[PDB]
Write a protein that binds this DNA or RNA. Sequence first.
RNA 1: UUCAUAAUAACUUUUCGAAUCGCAUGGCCUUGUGCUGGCGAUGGUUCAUUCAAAUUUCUGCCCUAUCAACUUUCGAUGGUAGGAUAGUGGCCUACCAUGGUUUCAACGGGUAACGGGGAAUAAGGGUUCGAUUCCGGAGAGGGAGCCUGAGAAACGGCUACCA
RNA 2: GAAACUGCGAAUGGCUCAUUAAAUCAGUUAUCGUUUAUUUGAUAGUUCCUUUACUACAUGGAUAUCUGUGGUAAUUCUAGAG
Lengths: 188, 260, 59
Amino acid sequence: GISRDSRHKRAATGAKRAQFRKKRKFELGRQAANTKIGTKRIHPVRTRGGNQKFRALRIETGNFSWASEGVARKTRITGVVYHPSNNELVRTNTLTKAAIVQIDATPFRQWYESHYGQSLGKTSKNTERKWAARAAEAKIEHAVDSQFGAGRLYAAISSRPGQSGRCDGYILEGEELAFYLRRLTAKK
Amino acid sequence: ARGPKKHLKRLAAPHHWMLDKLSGCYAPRPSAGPHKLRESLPLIVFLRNRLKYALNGREVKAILMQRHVKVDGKVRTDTTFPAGFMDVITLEATNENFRLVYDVKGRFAVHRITDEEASYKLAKVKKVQLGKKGIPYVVTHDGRTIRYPDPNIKVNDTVKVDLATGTITDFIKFDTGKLVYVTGGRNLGRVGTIVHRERHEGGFDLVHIKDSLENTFVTRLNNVFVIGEPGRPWISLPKGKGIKLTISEERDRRRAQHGL
Amino acid sequence: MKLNISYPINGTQKCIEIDDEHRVRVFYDKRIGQEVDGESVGDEFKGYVFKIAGGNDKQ
RNA sequence: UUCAUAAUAACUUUUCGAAUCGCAUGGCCUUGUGCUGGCGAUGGUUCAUUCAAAUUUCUGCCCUAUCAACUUUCGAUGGUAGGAUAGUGGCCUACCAUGGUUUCAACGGGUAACGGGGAAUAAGGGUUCGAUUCCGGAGAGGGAGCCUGAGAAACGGCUACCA
RNA sequence: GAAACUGCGAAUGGCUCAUUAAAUCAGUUAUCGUUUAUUUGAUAGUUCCUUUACUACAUGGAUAUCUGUGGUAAUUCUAGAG
Ligand SMILES: [Mg+2]
Ligand SMILES: [Mg+2]
Ligand SMILES: [Mg+2]
Ligand SMILES: [Mg+2]
Ligand SMILES: [Mg+2]
Ligand SMILES: [Mg+2]
Ligand SMILES: [Mg+2]
Ligand SMILES: [Mg+2]
Ligand SMILES: [Mg+2]
Ligand SMILES: [Mg+2]
Ligand SMILES: [Mg+2]
Ligand SMILES: [Mg+2]
Ligand SMILES: [Mg+2]
Ligand SMILES: [Mg+2]
């Protein structure tokens, strides 16, 4: 099997090392999960010392965080748009860590509406009062707002889906988001 | 090679078992327990090779079974149970109580003790941390975890555990000019005062120790076990009060105290 | 071709040999877990319907 | 230290939180067979610890130049991100950079080389030996590959090929 | 108290030195870089989900041995039924 040993490697000097000891189970490494989008399918793998890692071959949903607001919502992932490591992955639609994906965003929008009442694209008294107490806090980065109008938000996955089975991340914000956008533009 | 080792060869044993070179190929390997393998002392050794109450392993086993040996109040039935430093071994019949303390030379000494002291165990502090639900716990260098400790108990401080329940009754802060016991190295079994504590923030603090006879020596911090305020120890120390004589001196003593 | 007949309602078992391949031909290219009538098996077995389940090859 | 730990957000093909055993047969009467209660076994959560574990720092190996250049398409040295792993790491993958080692012997070759504690010799310095009772490490005809498990790439386990 | 299920162990021990020359190994560090049955300490009123009639004085279906019917020249081969 795939082994993470440094035995098979050459030394710093470039010397080809001799074959001492046949590969061990503590050196072992398993096949890549390389998770796809659509219909939840999670295979558990028995690791060292008991314990399970969860291979996430085919994932659809994920809970993503809006770090500015301080809220996270369970939402559908619809397509990988950019991945820093490989364009092949993007082509495939391979969900991994640090991949950039499009989120259904509707739940986020709903949450926003509940909170401030301002809406994106264009009742009780206590609620009104609450809204009044807030406001001006509801401004947001323009890019995010624009994205909302289309209905699909850019988010980065921060979970390792091949490890946890869980697919999670953060909605793209500030400078990083801008950078990502620029990259995307360049690619096109 | 493949999982844990389960045997111990007779030569590979700790030397302070005082185990004879012959009469067997194997030594009694201390089971997973409160004390470290090399720093421990298995019950079998204590029974057979110290007090001589048993003649062989079978005898020891038999003794154990009738629920009579007690390590720190709790019963025990393992032949290879690792009772270590400060552990109180109580035998119900005989009514003898023992505390496992080192002697001037290095090995574990048979130290007979009264029931008034046998009630408590003295223990060094290894770790101080907040556990789950923010609850503070102390870790004794001798096995235990004690929840909700007095919050000015730090690392290296020694603690009087009441043993019957397992609560901290009192403690000694680690400081200069406090009676100390050495539990590792060449200086193991020696009693002293702590003159000075060197730091070297990076690797291994060294403590300077003077004994009663004004005779200074240096050991690592993790080998040093506080015992009280100078001249007044919290436990009874064994005969020769952890003093270390020179060889010639020892010889002289042997000669002059002849009474055959 | 030997047969191992078992009746689960009573909990009774019997072993019956057939000396003719014509009487066994009913079983040829049938799968385990199928319904086979007794009529074509034997003139003795009438109104019977066997579940073929398990068996042994020569050797 | 982005630690211990706590807090808000949610998530989860929602892990665990005792439908388990032996001997005791004790205490209040609301006089039920009621409510109770002792010493233990096994279990089970995370944190300890202990027996361990993988790696890992610095320094040290025997002859040989009738081995002076070696490594880098097929990872060599470094970066970035991911994958994988118990976890660190070119360990592997993508994109990028052109490094890394060497006359203070790299690399190659040999060993009738397992390493060490040690052994023989015995002014001082040395020389030769160490398959072998202890400690490490490898291997179970050869090579692979795995299952079970806390732990094995196990061979008095399995699967294949070659002999 | 045979058998069988379950649990645990069979990764220790024992042997051998083929490979192996910065590898192993020795002394020395490190894990703020991890896994760890067992051990000895710790430890979980919150499983409920609206709160006028509900399994908890205790839930479900299996399967081993066993009894019977066999297969094969054969093996610590196991089919079928109860
Ligand atoms: Mg675990
Ligand atoms: Mg440190
Ligand atoms: Mg943290
Ligand atoms: Mg990385
Ligand atoms: Mg050889
Ligand atoms: Mg040699
Ligand atoms: Mg040797
Ligand atoms: Mg040889
Ligand atoms: Mg052979
Ligand atoms: Mg093998
Ligand atoms: Mg054999
Ligand atoms: Mg073996
Ligand atoms: Mg069994
Ligand atoms: Mg072995």
